[PDB]
Design a binder for this molecule. Structure first.
Ligand SMILES: OC[C@H]1O[C@H](O)[C@@H](O)[C@@H](O)[C@@H]1O
Ligand SMILES: OC[C@H]1O[C@H](O)[C@@H](O)[C@@H](O)[C@@H]1O
Ligand SMILES: OC[C@H]1O[C@H](O)[C@@H](O)[C@@H](O)[C@@H]1O
Ligand SMILES: OC[C@H]1O[C@H](O)[C@@H](O)[C@@H](O)[C@@H]1O
Ligand SMILES: [Ca+2]
Ligand SMILES: [Ca+2]
Ligand SMILES: [Ca+2]
Ligand SMILES: [Ca+2]
Ligand SMILES: [Ca+2]
Ligand SMILES: [Ca+2]
Ligand SMILES: [Ca+2]
Ligand SMILES: [Ca+2]
Lengths: 113, 113, 113, 113
């Protein structure tokens, strides 16, 4: 199945935070309506914080991409809702062979405020 | 039910990242074996990043506390596992009456490496 | 936080399946727009299947109640979305003191078809 | 990523319940330590309940397979833990082109009792 694709409410601010757990440099892109709106880049094996940003969801069509020097990683994802209100969308990825799926991570959360 | 309590594998590094979406100052504490090992503090209504740290899980007994000037918030939490390997533990909290449950957030992830 | 409350898409069929893991008789009610539309009753400690039904979501306001002889149980719940399409809403409950939270369970899933 | 693979605690009873939302006949197999221990078969587009069984987890290595007349479906899965105690493992699958991922579903839950 496609992974890293999420439908958010339209015209809503969301946070996105990215991490590396990898020797290779991760490129984590956040697409809103098929257009890259944020890019996080880096490496490190101890949950390196690559950045955190707030974006508008546009029509609601979000897609997360993870790659290493142009090669797409294998993604895994899901979305969880707590208290019928607090949403998280998580993405892990695997750039290699050890299948730890932590190499490049994105965590989205909404609503804000 | 108790919320914000998680059993991790013992002696394992994990990341914890904290956010505010609140006018009031949040105090988010990460306890390992009943001892506070990290504290994140701040306010802001746009997914303010309060910090991110890597901790050892000790025996595995983690507890997240959220309070505002000493008053415990109402917590909500769960844990998700992706690809049978990548773990997230999420905590939201409500400090007031609007029930957005985003006031003080913690996201834990493991394994690292 | 309130638990067992879920917002579904309006006018959508969903499945709901109920289980017991309890010595006491569980009463598991599925409310749509504040009106009970299904009730599952029984006991048994080996994941007793109490029933499975398909309901219309009405406006989308679903609430699950669990009680034992009129006494409300303590609920825990969340919602997960897989492949940006397949939804599950889960409810556990505790009727006693052992905090296994499995006494009366409901699992909702949608969309059907 | 591989999907439908879960690590359970060893020597633990778990419930597994299977559904169809499909015109084609689904074959849903539950493997414990690489050996099929339950098989659910059927079709129907309204959350047809194919069965529910309790199994021992063996070493803990569970795998869910879904196929239609021998052809493996595309699986999606995850695991959620509520109240640090109640576990669900969910599997959806797609046998065709509409990407509803509901064609053959398995829901696992533990602990029982
Ligand atoms: O980035 C390449 C490689 O780096 C490290 O060895 C580990 O983090 C691996 O999981 C990762 O796949
Ligand atoms: O922190 C107090 C209060 O601040 C803001 O008004 C909002 O973020 C509320 O959700 C929060 O409860
Ligand atoms: O139903 C009462 C009681 O019955 C059994 O002892 C167990 O299933 C308990 O978890 C439950 O709380
Ligand atoms: O089973 C084949 C096909 O049957 C129906 O048309 C729908 O349930 C589809 O989602 C499914 O893929
Ligand atoms: Ca890796
Ligand atoms: Ca890694
Ligand atoms: Ca609030
Ligand atoms: Ca808030
Ligand atoms: Ca109980
Ligand atoms: Ca029980
Ligand atoms: Ca299908
Ligand atoms: Ca279908």
């Amino acid at each position: 199945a496609q992974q890293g694709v999420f439908t958010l409410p339209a015209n809503t601010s969301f946070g996105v935070t990215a991490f590396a757990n990898a020797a290779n440099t991760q490129t984590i892109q956040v697409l809103v309506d098929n257009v890259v709106k944020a890019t996080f880049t880096g490496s490190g094996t101890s949950d390196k914080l690559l950045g955190s940003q707030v974006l508008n969801s546009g029509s609601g069509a979000i897609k997360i991409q993870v790659s290493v020097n142009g090669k797409p990683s294998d993604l895994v994802s899901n979305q969880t809702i707590l208290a019928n209100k607090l949403n998280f969308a998580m993405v892990g990825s695997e750039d290699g062979t050890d299948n730890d799926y932590n190499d490049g991570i994105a965590v989205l959360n909404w609503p804000l405020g």
